[PDB]
């Protein structure tokens, strides 16, 4: 219920553009922690971008977990049928969808939730045993393949509660059902700016963490005024080292922001 501040670091593998090597990610996390040892860190893993090997992700997660950071991971569910096209009532069960790569057939909603989603979570826990804190379910909750019933949503939220995981959401479509099940939620930046506000902050304060892009004192002031109790603050930058420059500047500016707000509320 007391207000808490978190520093959000986006971590993706090197590509022609930005990203960061495992060594750069570890070096950045060490400097960020040294700059604000009293502020939590949330690592947004896997978010023209490169990809990590599994061993690289494991080394990154191990280093961040040892520092005490929380990890948000992209589950990256396969929701399109095993490329082999389908010819029967499976066609009636596989919703045809056109993406940037043409026609695809969604995996039947029953087979995904029953066997494929729990297996993906089991493979996830086997690779990062007890080291993940939030999971991203874009293709499941906000994809063009599935419209989950309220019963199916609670079944999913039960699958990640069993693994001790929260969820990072890109939309408010299932928000109220998310808090009702008592799962931790990480609200992405530009979710409302892309309607739900105060009521849940007063209802479930310790369940909601809102990620905001820092601009000025108004960023922290508006979040506190709206009732947010956990504010994950993302700074500018693209690669991990470029984010480090913005974070180190932002830690100094945010200290002045909180100090000025404290004198006004005194």
Numbering used by the authors: 3 to 49, 66 to 212, 221 to 292
Q: What's the paper's own text on this?
A:
Using a combination of trRosetta hallucination, iterative cycles of deep-learning-based structure prediction, and ProteinMPNN sequence design, we designed proteins with 290 amino acids incorporating the active site while reducing the molecular weight by over 100 kDa compared to the initial endo-α-N-acetylgalactosaminidase. Despite lacking detectable enzymatic activity, the experimentally determined crystal structures of a representative design closely matched the design with a root-mean-square deviation of 1.0 Å, with most catalytically important side chains within 2.0 Å.
dEngBF4 crystallized in two different space groups, P212121 (form 1) and P61 (form 2), and the crystal structures of the protein were determined using the molecular replacement method described in Materials and Methods. Form 1 has two protein molecules, 1A and 1B, in the asymmetric unit, whereas for form 2 one protein molecule is present in the asymmetric unit, resulting in three separate structures. Specifically, loop regions ranging from Gly50-Gly65 and Glu210-Val220 were poorly defined or lacked electron density (insert I and II), correlating with regions displaying increased dynamics in the molecular dynamics simulations and low pLDDT confidence score. The dEngBF4 crystal structure (form 1, molecule A) was aligned to the backbone structure of the designed model, revealing a Cα RMSD of 1.0 Å across 191 residues with respect to the OmegaFold model. The specifically restrained catalytic residues exhibited a Cα RMSD of 1.2 Å across 31 atoms relative to the OmegaFold model and 2.0 Å over 34 atoms relative to the EngBF enzyme crystal structure (inserts). Additionally, key catalytic residues, Glu188 and Asp156, corresponding to the catalytic acid/base and nucleophile, respectively, were found to be positioned within 3.4 Å, compared to the 4.2 Å separation observed in EngBF.
